[PDB]
Amino acid sequence: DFLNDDYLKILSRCPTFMFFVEGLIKQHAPADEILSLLTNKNRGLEEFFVEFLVRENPINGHAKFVAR
């Protein structure tokens, strides 16, 4: 609930996130979803942040059940 604008600014500079943005730019000539989600409206940005934060990071689980 305390996801602040300064944290949003600093996390926006993520280079893999830049790779994602540019890959989508090249994949779609239209640019509606990027304007929907990008910092220009921070609601979508924080929604994406939580969406990809809840992920499992499957590499660790893969190591775990590989040991299993």
Binding site: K26, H28, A29, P30
Partner: protein
């Protein structure tokens, strides 16, 4: 440097607006549909936008023009690929066309000064001689070495064929079925 100038010029293409509407951007977009590979430009619009190109293009026009040509080619490549991604290999340089209304200078008042600069004038037309052609991209083979090469000429429609790729001097034949040319005419005035 030259890249600072080329950037200050390319910004004028897409980052300029008047009457709250893009002019040159959509002009290029329409021109590419027309298959024109050229444009129109007003040099009055460039004085207020930027002064880093006027005072140096005035005195070194030949030095600065081809940079603008290449910048236009770059913009064309970007917009071409983006438009192909939007809907629906060979993109040569685009001729730059401009005009002005700053002043007019008569032939009588000319001198041997301000030579190689840019000038304005008026007159009347007489000659329509012939569509004499020049070369832009022509291929070459050496007659003994059978060594293929290539050459391209840009604006002077300075250098000659290579004198040596034993074969001796003048070892090159000129192909035509795989060459490229443009047109020009010798126009008069009085």
């Amino acid at each position: 440097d030259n890249t600072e100038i080329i950037k200050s010029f390319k910004n004028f293409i897409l980052e300029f607006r008047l009457d709250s509407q893009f002019i040159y951007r959509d002009q290029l977009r329409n021109n590419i549909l027309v298959k024109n590979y050229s444009l129109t430009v007003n040099m009055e619009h460039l004085i207020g936008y930027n002064e880093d190109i006027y005072k140096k293009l005035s005195d070194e026009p030949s030095d600065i023009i081809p940079l603008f040509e290449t910048a236009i080619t770059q913009v064309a490549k970007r917009i071409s690929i983006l438009s192909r991604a939007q809907s629906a290999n060979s993109l040569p340089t685009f001729q730059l066309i401009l005009n002005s209304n700053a002043n007019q200078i008569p032939l009588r008042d000319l001198d041997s000064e301000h030579v190689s600069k840019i000038v304005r004038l008026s007159g009347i037309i007489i000659s329509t001689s012939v569509l004499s052609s020049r070369a832009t991209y022509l291929s070459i083979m050496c007659r003994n070495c059978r060594h293929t090469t290539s050459i391209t000429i840009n604006n002077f429609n300075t250098v000659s064929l290579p004198r040596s790729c034993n074969c001796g001097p003048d070892p090159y034949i000129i192909i035509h079925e795989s060459s490229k040319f443009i047109d020009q005419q010798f126009l008069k005035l009085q």
